[PDB]
């Protein structure tokens, strides 16, 4: 009875940025699930395609835990069929996404007085992302007709932009840690206590 290391991804000391989201393949274990849903410390717990209670008695071929950090007003973009700077250039969920989107406020951790500018997010990109695509390219983006010879300037902007996280920010502009569980469904390797 080896439970899945959900404490290693949810409580993770340092979280990766949304443009370079961290995926941890979870396999060969039993998912408690009910322990995560019982905790009231999460501000958003939306599931798609599968009921959270039925997952406690079901099995899947593989599960993936995608963890990153965004802002409050951007959590609504972590959902199937969403548009925005996060859903198009950073983390795109499929229109047939089968899983759960979990998010909670982390203003007392990732925010520092004077500003914590270590979390980044892609601001420019010539085409929207594919579902579950990950872009870490630091290539200078060409906005206008002028060629961009790898030097920043007018219509020559660095694609990544830093977040401004201060404890004095509004409730909708604070750092929120998001964990997305993708249920890839071959023999099943992750089951619930029911089975």
């Amino acid at each position: 009875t080896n439970l899945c290391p959900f404490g290693e991804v949810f409580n993770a000391t340092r979280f990766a940025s949304v443009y370079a989201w961290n995926r941890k393949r979870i396999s060969n274990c039993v998912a408690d699930y009910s322990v995560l849903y019982n905790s009231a410390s999460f501000s958003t717990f939306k599931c798609y395609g599968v009921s959270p209670t039925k997952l406690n008695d079901l099995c899947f071929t593989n599960v993936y835990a995608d963890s990153f950090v965004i802002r409050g007003d951007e959590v609504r973009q972590i959902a199937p069929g969403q548009t925005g700077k996060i859903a198009d250039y950073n983390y795109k969920l499929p229109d047939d996404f089968t899983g759960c989107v979990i998010a909670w406020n982390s203003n007392n951790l990732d925010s520092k007085v004077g500003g914590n500018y270590n979390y980044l997010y892609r601001l420019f990109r010539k085409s929207n992302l594919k579902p579950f695509e990950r872009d870490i390219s630091t290539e200078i983006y060409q906005a206008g007709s002028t060629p961009c010879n790898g030097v920043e300037g007018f219509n020559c902007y660095f694609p990544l932009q830093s977040y401004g996280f201060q404890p004095t920010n509004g409730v909708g502009y604070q750092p929120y840690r998001v964990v997305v569980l993708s249920f890839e469904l071959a023999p099943a390797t992750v089951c619930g206590p029911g089975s």
Partner: antibody
Amino acid sequence: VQLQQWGAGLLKPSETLSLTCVVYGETLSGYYWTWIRQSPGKGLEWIGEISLRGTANYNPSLKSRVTLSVEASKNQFSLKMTSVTAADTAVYYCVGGVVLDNVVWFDPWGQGIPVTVSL
Amino acid sequence: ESVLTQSPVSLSLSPGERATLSCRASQSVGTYLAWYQHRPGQAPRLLIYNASKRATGIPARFSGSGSGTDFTLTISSLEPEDLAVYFCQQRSNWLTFGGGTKVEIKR
């Protein structure tokens, strides 16, 4: 989203222009904040833009006299001009540069503060 | 540098009529055009961006069209609050603001 603005309105033809502009209800993240001015009947002239990371783009005409700045702590950014002549008398707007479909436009315009330059 | 010209310079149209403002470009720009509205005693706003996309909170009367060098801004129904000066801008290589067209209301 609103923009507050400070700055002196009367300078000598040999002093230094100084204008600050603070942003409220919005972090200065995904924006390229710029200064745009318009002398009476002259037409709009793009002074220069700056971001949170400090990258600065300037107009080739006044690139020598303009020294922008940015204070991410107070959510403010300033504009300083050296040796302001009488031709610099204009209404100075502090404008935010949105990123709409990979094209940087100017959605949050400001009211503006005129700077009369005379002895 | 590309220059922007607007036709006409002043428009006198009664409320309820359709005003079509043109902004011609000296060089090829494509869809890198935008229309701004400057109320008489207020700060300017962004009405149309990318030559056809209506900005947030802008009434449906304002509609942009055109691509390449000839763009048209069409106000479907002039309302008494639409009395302002409208100017265009391009971002194809360098920022060049248009001359501007004044919209006058007849009564």
